[PDB]
Amino acid sequence: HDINNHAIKSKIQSYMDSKGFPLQWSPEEYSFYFELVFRDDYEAQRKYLLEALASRKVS
Amino acid sequence: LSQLAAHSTIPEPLLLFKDNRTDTHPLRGLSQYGPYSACFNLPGQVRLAYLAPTEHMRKLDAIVRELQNPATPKEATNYYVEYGGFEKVFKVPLVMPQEHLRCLALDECHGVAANGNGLALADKIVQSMSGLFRQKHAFDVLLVYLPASWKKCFEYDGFDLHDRIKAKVAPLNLPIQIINDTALTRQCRANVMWGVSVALYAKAGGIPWKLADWDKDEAYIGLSYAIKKNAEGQEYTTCCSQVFDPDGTGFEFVAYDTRDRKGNPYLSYQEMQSVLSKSLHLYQSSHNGRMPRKIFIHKTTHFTEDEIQGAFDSFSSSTEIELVQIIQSTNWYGLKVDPASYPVDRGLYQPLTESECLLWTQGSVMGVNQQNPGQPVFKEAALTPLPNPIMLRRFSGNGGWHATCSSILALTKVDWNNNTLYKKLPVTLVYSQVFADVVKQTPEIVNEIYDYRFFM
Amino acid sequence: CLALDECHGVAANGNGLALADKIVQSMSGLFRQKHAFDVLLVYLPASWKKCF
Amino acid sequence: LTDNEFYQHYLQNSQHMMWFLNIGHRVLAALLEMNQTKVVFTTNFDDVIETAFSDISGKHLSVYGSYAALSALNTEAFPIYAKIHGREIHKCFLAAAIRFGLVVSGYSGRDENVMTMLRAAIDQNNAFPHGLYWTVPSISKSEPAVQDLITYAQGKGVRAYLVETGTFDEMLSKIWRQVKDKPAAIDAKVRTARVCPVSIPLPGPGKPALRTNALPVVTQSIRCGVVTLASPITFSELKERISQKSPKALLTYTVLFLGGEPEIRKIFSNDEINSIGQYYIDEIAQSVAASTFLKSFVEEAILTALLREKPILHRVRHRTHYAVIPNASAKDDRFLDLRKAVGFKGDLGYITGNVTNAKELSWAEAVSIRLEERGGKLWIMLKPEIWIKPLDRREEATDFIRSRRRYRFNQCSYQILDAWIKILFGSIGGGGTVNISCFPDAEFKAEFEIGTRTAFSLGVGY
RNA sequence: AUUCCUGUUAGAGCUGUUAAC
DNA sequence: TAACAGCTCTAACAGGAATA
Ligand SMILES: [Mg+2]
Incomplete structure (x- = not known):
């Protein structure tokens, strides 16, 4: 599944809402999902944020 | 030891309507936004014809005439919304049939009503409607009415009157919405009006609603069977159904036979691989020949060792096959505590063991009720006090309860024949069962595949 | 399938939008058997030239 | 990690x-x-x-x-x-x-x-x-x-x-x-x-929970008796022998038994009996999953151990056991909680009586008790139900059955299940691992420890 | 058969365990 | 192939209408 598909986005968001997570584009969500995925591991969090915003995709 | 795996409550799936305005509650969304196909104007005006004995033509005409007037629900008012009429709710005019289209049931049918011959009665009804074979373009949906006086031939051992009639007419490609005396008594007029209006609109060719944000690359197969009580042994009729979504906005829900003789409801290697080749072809034609990245199969009984390999050998490596068996009868049942005043939430699935989960297809739904806003609604509170959780047994899926559970939960909401919020089973299972009955009654249907709008 | 006779009336009225809508609405009979037909050969008689 | x-x-x-x-x-x-x-x-x-x-x-x-x-x-x-x-x-x-x-x-x-x-x-x-x-x-x-x-x-x-x-x-x-x-x-x-072989992991226990009706069984193994026969036997012959004799022991073929030796000597003569030994089924869950005879034997053993010392009557319906309330002992104080649960709008509720529109059918409250082998676990499955004294006339009370349970909603059903658990085990589902035993005065007895608290799970959240 | 699936009454098919043929 | 146990489902009827 490609994340920018509407169907896959809706399915993933429904799954997230199934486990009681915040609903939609609401505050304390971005940090919430970061702290959920990386379970308070700031080195791995930094490495992922570096990889996503790395200096190869920037034009 | 009294601790179980954490349950997860799948949210209520959304339905797609006109201008892609989503809503969980189907009838309310139909009132607010209209049918999904209203933007395409696919049905246009709806033109319908009659076929009934002349003595009860006034009652058939009265129900159709009522269809064009508002109705307010008195039963199940906690769920049903005010009806606004076919012209307003569906944004489509309802056409009064002309005398040329209107037909009368031939007299000898009444006579054969005394004889108690179901096959003769069905054939005589088909010959009565034969006056409408040439004028297929004039009308879209036929409204066959069977009077209560024919109840002797309605149902008896080895024969089903509606099943036989639809099995005879489907090859004729005429869409009928059989109406019996039941329609006009279920005290609540809005209930029946929603039912008939949605059935006729979908029967006409329109799509009242579609699964919101449904993946077009996944095909949900469903296999069911039916019993024919042979004199010497038993006969098992197995038929498949597909509910995939093509490249366009079209729903594409079909039913077909799996075929020479079967004494057990378990498809062998050859038969299962053949039917899975056959349903794949229907998906490819609708989807421009692209293969399905994931296949769901819902069988009422467990998959055999040979049957799983048959399902596998029919597809390529890219396809993901999640074989699932759906069990309706289980010893388990759930009670919701926070003791909740309303039963356990619909969609709450509980993973019991590896490849065994409990799905609460039946249950309370939030925000659907009309009266007393902001309160849960239990659809089956009339029949059962508490919901009965169905059980999924996984046989092939690599991983993930969410995929199958959400897919099934959403599938239990696109039964247009059903005028309530949901069902107990995915539409694949119920339509495979209906077509299994149709094929069991009429053996000369096995060759061709049929759409859902015929047998719904 | 067979086009509605109302298409002829619309064509005589010289209304292209309604004519196209009626031609599309005539497709419902083929819609059920969407599985049945891979392609569709839509023909337009010369009498509809006024809306071509 | x-x-x-x-x-x-x-x-x-x-x-x-x-x-x-x-x-x-x-x-x-x-x-x-x-x-x-x-x-x-x-x-x-x-x-x-x-x-x-x-x-x-x-x-x-x-x-x-x-x-x-x-x-x-x-x-x-x-x-x-x-x-x-x-x-x-x-x-x-x-x-x-x-x-x-x-x-x-x-x-x-x-x-x-x-x-x-x-x-x-x-x-x-x-x-x-x-x-x-x-x-x-x-x-x-x-x-x-x-x-x-x-x-x-x-x-x-x-x-x-x-x-x-x-x-x-x-x-x-x-x-x-x-x-x-x-x-x-x-x-x-x-x-x-x-x-x-699909095997998808069960998530963590996590923390609106749902309370199921399943009672865990933690008795991982039980001891039982074996009799050796000089001649082959069929299960039907054994079953009709028990029916005609009715000993105070539970029998099956796999020949396996649980109870007193004199009952075995009564059911089987000395000539056909070779010797009596012991069987130790180490894994109860796997055994009852593999063999259905063991499944029936174990469920009947638990049933016998459950109503051994209690006034409630034990009945059978389509090979499913029921704990039906007897009319004579329906006035016990232990049923008072059930009296509260059946009660309408916070009053006393009848638990055994006469159906309003039938000549002789008498209705009572009951629970169907079943054994469920799920994964590698045994669960005691409690389903509340209304039992009718004539087994073959039950359908004549169908409307009444619909009338009584019409409003046994989530709160009422919760109360009913809690009251029935209290009646069947004597303790609430808090720190409860009560022990039952069938035929305690016999050489081959079975003691089963059943968790009193019904199985439940909390939805996983942040 | 506008619908929903709750019950009742039965039977079948799957598995097993024995007895064999 | 003939019993036995359980799991599960369909076949025919009957049947009331969604927290009272
Ligand atoms: Mg219908």
């Missing part, structure tokens, strides 16, 4: 993760060809890694001269394959150790040469910067040396971890199913084979 954390951490940086050691070889061959996890070490032959790589790509694999591994690693000419065969690769492993984190699977240690190899690799300033991950199929089954080395590395400051995953091939399949941007040819080659 749970495998999910290991997968999130391993997937993010698979370019620089070393591997020390059929989907698993196949996924590894695809993973190498893909230039990820450049260096792989191994102990054994398994010459199938290079064969799988050749099948994947079509070119030979460098397999390991004096310092050929050193030359290949230092020149950065990946992918590199070297077998320990246990100091030629020792220098190379130490050189590899700083460059990328290592994960070792399929190895329990037990070899001092590689043990000292790894311990010497740990000491340097930046050793295994990404981490050392030990993946064994089961944590508790691993050798003590592995845990000792993990603790030593953690004390040294390295980020070594011991994570529990499945089999190495299954672990690699789960890893590869989430690796991104893989060429079409590789995916066609591997396709992760096919998963016949």
Whole structure:
């Protein structure tokens, strides 16, 4: 599944809402999902944020 | 030891309507936004014809005439919304049939009503409607009415009157919405009006609603069977159904036979691989020949060792096959505590063991009720006090309860024949069962595949 | 399938939008058997030239 | 560190993760060809890694001269394959150790040469910067040396971890199913084979919970008796013998029994009986799952043990047992809670009486008690129900059955189930593991300890 | 058969365990 | 192939209408 598909986005968001997570584009969500995925591991969090915003995709 | 795996409550799936305005509650969304196909104007005006004995033509005409007037629900008012009429709710005019289209049931049918011959009665009804074979373009949906006086031939051992009639007419490609005396008594007029209006609109060719944000690359197969009580042994009729979504906005829900003789409801290697080749072809034609990245199969009984390999050998490596068996009868049942005043939430699935989960297809739904806003609604509170959780047994899926559970939960909401919020089973299972009955009654249907709008 | 006779009336009225809508609405009979037909050969008689 | 954390951490940086050691070889061959996890070490032959790589790509694999591994690693000419065969690769492993984190699977240690190899690799300033991950199929089954080395590395400051995953091939399949941007040819080659024995992990217990009707059974094994016969017997003959004799014991064929010896001497004469011995079914769940005779025997044993000392009557309906309330003992104080639960709008509620519109049918409250073998667990399944005194006239009270239960909603059904649990076990579902025993005054008795609290689970949340 | 699936009454098919033929 | 146990489903009827 490609994340920018509407169907896959809706399915993933429904799954997230199934486990009681915040609903939609609401505050304390971005940090919430970061702290959920990386379970308070700031080195791995930094490495992922570096990889996503790395200096190869920037034009 | 009294601790179980954490349950997860799948949210209520959304339905797609006109201008892609989503809503969980189907009838309310139909009132607010209209049918999904209203933007395409696919049905246009709806033109319908009659076929009934002349003595009860006034009652058939009265129900159709009522269809064009508002109705307010008195039963199940906690769920049903005010009806606004076919012209307003569906944004489509309802056409009064002309005398040329209107037909009368031939007299000898009444006579054969005394004889108690179901096959003769069905054939005589088909010959009565034969006056409408040439004028297929004039009308879209036929409204066959069977009077209560024919109840002797309605149902008896080895024969089903509606099943036989639809099995005879489907090859004729005429869409009928059989109406019996039941329609006009279920005290609540809005209930029946929603039912008939949605059935006729979908029967006409329109799509009242579609699964919101449904993946077009996944095909949900469903296999069911039916019993024919042979004199010497038993006969098992197995038929498949597909509910995939093509490249366009079209729903594409079909039913077909799996075929020479079967004494057990378990498809062998050859038969299962053949039917899975056959349903794949229907998906490819609708989807421009692209293969399905994931296949769901819902069988009422467990998959055999040979049957799983048959399902596998029919597809390529890219396809993901999640074989699932759906069990309706289980010893388990759930009670919701926070003791909740309303039963356990619909969609709450509980993973019991590896490849065994409990799905609460039946249950309370939030925000659907009309009266007393902001309160849960239990659809089956009339029949059962508490919901009965169905059980999924996984046989092939690599991983993930969410995929199958959400897919099934959403599938239990696109039964247009059903005028309530949901069902107990995915539409694949119920339509495979209906077509299994149709094929069991009429053996000369096995060759061709049929759409859902015929047998719904 | 067979086009509605109302298409002829619309064509005589010289209304292209309604004519196209009626031609599309005539497709419902083929819609059920969407599985049945891979392609569709839509023909337009010369009498509809006024809306071509 | 749970495998999910290991997968999130391993997937993010698979370019620089070393591997020390059929989907698993196949996924590894695809993973190498893909230039990820450049260096792989191994102990054994398994010459199938290079064969799988050749099948994947079509070119030979460098397999390991004096310092050929050193030359290949230092020149950065990946992918590199070297077998320990246990100091030629020792220098190379130490050189590899700083460059990328290592994960070792399929190895329990037990070899001092590689043990000292790894311990010497740990000491340097930046050793295994990404981490050392030990993946064994089961944590508790691993050798003590592995845990000792993990603790030593953690004390040294390295980020070594011991994570529990499945089999190495299954672990690699789960890893590869989430690796991104893989060429079409590789995916066609591997396709992760096919998963016949589906086994998806149950999530954590987590914390609007639902309360089920299932009572756990923790009695993992029971003791029972065996009788030896000089002649073959059929189950139907035994069943009709019990019906005609009605002993105070439970019988089945697999011939197996539970009760008093004199009852066995009554049911079976001396001539047909050879000897009486004992049977110890070590795994009750597996036994009742494999054999249905054991299932029926065990469920009937639990039923007999459950209503042995209680005034409630025990009935049977389509081979399902029911705990039906007798009319004579319906006035007990223990039923008072049930009197409250059936009661309408907070009043006393009748639990046994006469149906309003039938001549002689008498209705009572009851619960169907069933045995459910789910996974490897036994559950006692309680279903509230309305029993009718004539077994074959039940349908004549159908409307009444619909009338009484019409409003037994979630709160009312919750009260009914709690009251029935209290009646059946005498204690509430808080810290309850009460014990029952069937035929306590017999040589072959069965004691079962049933958890009093019904099974339940809380929805996982943040 | 506008619908929903709750009950009742039965039977079949799958598995098993025995007895064999 | 003939019993036995359980799991599960369909075949025919009957049947009331969604927290009272
Ligand atoms: Mg219908």
